[PDB]
Write a protein that binds this ligand. Structure first.
Ligand code: PGT
Ligand code: PGT
Ligand code: PCF
Ligand code: PCF
Ligand code: HEM
Lengths: 93, 74, 72, 57, 51, 248, 52
């Protein structure tokens, strides 16, 4: 089996990442834990915090495009109502 | 007795007549079609009408209250 | 040659290469109604144009049309 | 409360598959029967079971 | 609270049907009869309770 | 677009067959069949469904066979090749006065009658759409609109004119009760029957759907618990960094 | 006495009969084809798409 192409990541033992020393992990079995120890605190506090964090980039474009669509809808409704015989002829020229 | 939907229409339009505000459009349609209904020239096909949007809004408003009184005896 | 033979096998056969013919009577069509008849894979309009509509058809400005085409 | 009587039942593997599948079959059968019964008794008159007596004289 | 609502539901299911009259249409007829004449206080608001 | 022919949306009525935990009120489908067959017989076709689904939900065992015996279905020719006439079967399709389609367009004084087997889903809206179309049309067109001679009006339906003969007069249905002779009852009957014909599986579909949503909800909660369980040992592991001694 | 009613008519052109006779005597057999508006059956002899 010929070796494959040169790639940064590979198989176990040769991740290719920088050699590191001084890192210590501390795991513990899921059997000796409460599997839902903090579900409520997460789903309330962390969810609200993430929503507040993302509340500065999402709603503005939605609102501006909603205003654009609504203004177009109002223009369309007003054009074909008591103005189609005098205003609609001077817009289709 | 042999009148269910029409009776509901009657009662609902009576309630509307208690605050009658759309029949001014009925009378403006009457004056439009009593004053502007005699084009003797045959090259006209765009008679203006203050009825279509009037009728649409009237039926929509009165029928918005219609889906009630489920006395549909079977 | 093989690709051409396969394509010619895939393409239209003998029976589809025959065009159908149909006749529509113009006596029963109403003046203010539209009649659409299918011909050989696609429909065909049959409308009794009013005399007023003929004038509108033949009095269309050419500058407003990208393709110059008259009614006649 | 988990005595040795219940502890012993958590060691068989070769035979546990067949009995667990049979238990699943029994559970699905009883669940289907219960759901059918509840759909039956949640709607009376509309269903076709009692229209036979309704049309009966 | 969950035990309360669950036990109430199961005991109600075990109770069984015990009302051959007073359906929705019965209440509709009664309310129409009461709120059709005799100086109705603005037609009343006697909506049917539930199933 | 322009609301004149776009069609104003009908309000969402309340039916017996619009809900999550419901069935067809097929105590009235036995009545919807009569209301359809008494008036709509020589008007439309509906020829898409068979009679094997008309037993057990609208008729029990015998009247279907009476109807089969009532009509002739143009049997196979005999050994002489001559045509004959035979009673119908219980696995045939609902017939129609027109041979196949020819007698329809000749008598309608206009267009063709659409197949009612799918009109319930053939238009936007749905169950209430046909009710609004058959109820909301007045007996007189709006002021200033002169319809073509011989055409009626309907404001709800986009188009403002149809070849429909307004055969909806009451007082001539009277099955065995006082229910008929008012437009609402027959309108509800016809719309429920048309919905059933367009979808003769509503009860079974809803039962299977209830079972499926129950089992998938249980499985979804189960997967939630197990994922939160066996990821507990990896979502809590902590790292501590001690700088190494300064010697390469 | 036997059928041979399995082939179309466009295959007999240019093999034994040229074009004139097969299409000319394509007007010697009725076929009970499409009717008129009233539905009365119309018999006109068939064309290239007609089989044997
Ligand atoms: C009024 C609606 C009622 C719906 C009832 C059915 C659904 C019940 C759901 C569980 C009860 C609600 C508990 C409160 C909300 C929990 C939300 C949450 O974040 O909790 C866990 C959510 O558990 C999941 O894994 C949820 C997977 C979400 C899948 C993608 C999002 C879809 C929408 C989810 C909500 C709606 C689900 C039902 C939609 C019909 C934690 O996330 P995680 O397990 O991925 O861990 C991440 C981290 O540790 C945070 O602590
Ligand atoms: C105009 C104004 C608009 C205002 C609203 C803008 C949009 C904001 C909506 C609320 C967003 C809240 C985010 C934080 C709450 C939370 O925990 O959400 C997660 C939980 O899901 C929800 O409750 C919201 C779902 C949002 C979309 C999730 C996509 C998941 C993959 C696709 C699933 C299908 C689509 C979503 C369900 C319909 C989703 O995050 P994730 O996909 O990274 O999952 C992380 C993990 O599951 C944590 O438990
Ligand atoms: C034509 C069949 C199409 C397919 C027919 C329908 C198949 C539908 C399968 C759906 C998925 C089912 C997944 C779970 C099956 C199962 O029971 O797996 C559990 C075991 C592992 O768990 P366990 O060892 O039984 O746990 C008990 C441990 N003790 C108590 C001793 C401490 O897993 C095993 O031991 C796996 C052993 C091999 C698979 C056995 C299952 C039955 C296979 C029948 C056919 C065998 C060939
Ligand atoms: C819009 C509504 C959304 C929520 C729907 C909930 C169900 C509902 O509206 O009630 C359905 C019936 C009500 O039943 P009930 O009128 O309170 O008690 C009658 C008990 N019987 C006489 C039948 C034995 O319930 C029953 O007959 C069954 C008892 C309650 C349901 C069982 C527990 C929950 C199962 C999931
Ligand atoms: C007996 C009562 C009738 C009922 C319940 C009924 C029902 C319907 C329905 C639902 C439609 C289509 C509506 C839609 O667009 O979704 C329709 C269309 C039509 N019906 Fe009826 N109909 C009846 C009577 C008749 C009669 C007597 C005729 C005449 C013989 C007729 C001829 C037509 C035609 C020609 C159309 C199509 C109109 C078009 O293409 O513009 N109908 N009918």
């Amino acid at each position: 089996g010929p070796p494959s192409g040169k790639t940064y990541m590979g198989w176990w033992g040769h991740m290719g990442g920088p050699k590191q020393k001084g890192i210590t992990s501390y795991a513990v079995s899921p059997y000796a834990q409460k599997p839902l120890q903090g579900i409520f605190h997460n789903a309330v506090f962390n969810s609200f915090r993430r929503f507040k964090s993302q509340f500065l980039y999402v709603l503005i474009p939605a609102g501006i495009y909603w205003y654009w669509w609504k203004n177009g809808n109002e223009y369309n409704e007003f054009l074909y109502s008591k103005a189609g015989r005098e205003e609609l002829e001077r817009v289709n020229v | 007795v042999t009148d269910q939907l029409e009776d509901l229409r009657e009662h609902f339009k009576n309630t509307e007549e208690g605050k009658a505000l759309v029949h001014h459009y009925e009378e403006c349609a009457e004056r439009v079609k009593i004053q502007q209904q005699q084009p003797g020239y045959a090259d006209l096909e765009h008679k203006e009408d203050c009825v279509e949007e009037f009728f649409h809004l009237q039926h929509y408003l009165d029928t918005a209250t219609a889906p009630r009184l489920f006395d549909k005896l079977k | 040659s093989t690709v051409e033979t396969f394509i010619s096998s895939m393409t239209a056969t003998a029976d589809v290469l025959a065009m159908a013919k149909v006749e529509v009577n113009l006596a029963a069509i109403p003046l203010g109604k539209n009649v659409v008849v299918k011909w050989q894979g696609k429909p065909v309009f049959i409308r009794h144009r009013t005399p007023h509509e003929i004038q509108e058809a033949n009095s269309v400005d050419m500058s407003a049309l990208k393709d110059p085409q008259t009614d006649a | 409360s988990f005595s040795s009587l219940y502890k012993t039942f958590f060691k068989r593997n070769a035979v546990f598959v067949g009995t667990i599948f049979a238990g699943a079959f029994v559970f699905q059968t009883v669940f289907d029967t219960a759901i059918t019964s509840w759909y039956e008794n949640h709607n009376k008159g509309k269903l076709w079971k009692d229209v036979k007596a309704r049309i009966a004289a | 609270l969950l035990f309360s609502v669950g036990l109430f539901a199961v005991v109600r299911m075990a109770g069984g049907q015990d009302a051959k009259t007073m359906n929705k249409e019965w209440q509709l007829k009664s309310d129409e009869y009461l709120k059709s004449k005799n100086a109705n206080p603005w037609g009343g608001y006697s909506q049917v309770q539930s199933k | 677009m322009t609301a004149a022919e776009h069609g104003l949306h009908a309000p969402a009525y309340a039916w017996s067959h619009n809900g999550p935990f419901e069935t067809f009120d097929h105590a009235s489908i036995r009545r919807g069949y009569q209301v359809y067959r008494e008036v709509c017989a020589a008007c439309h076709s509906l020829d898409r469904v068979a009679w094997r689904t008309l037993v057990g939900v609208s008729h029990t065992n015998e009247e279907v066979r009476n109807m089969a015996e009532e009509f002739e279905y143009d049997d196979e020719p005999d050994e002489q090749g001559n045509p004959k006439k035979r009673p119908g079967k219980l696995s045939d399709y609902i017939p129609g006065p027109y041979p196949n389609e020819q007698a329809a367009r000749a008598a309608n004084q206009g267009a063709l009658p659409p197949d009612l087997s799918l009109i319930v889903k053939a238009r936007h809206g749905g169950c209430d759409y046909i009710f609004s179309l058959l109820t909301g049309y007045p007996d007189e067109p709006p002021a200033g609109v002169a319809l073509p001679p011989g055409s009626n009006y309907n404001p709800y339906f986009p188009g403002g004119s149809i070849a429909m003969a307004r055969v909806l007069f009451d007082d001539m249905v009277e099955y065995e009760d006082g229910t008929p002779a008012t437009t609402s009852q027959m309108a509800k009957d016809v719309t429920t029957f048309l919905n059933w014909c367009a979808e003769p599986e509503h009860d079974e579909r809803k039962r299977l759907g209830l079972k499926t949503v129950i089992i998938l909800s249980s499985l979804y909660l189960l997967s939630i618990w197990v994922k939160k369980f066996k990821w507990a040992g990896i979502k809590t592991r902590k790292f501590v960094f001690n700088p190494p001694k300064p010697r390469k």
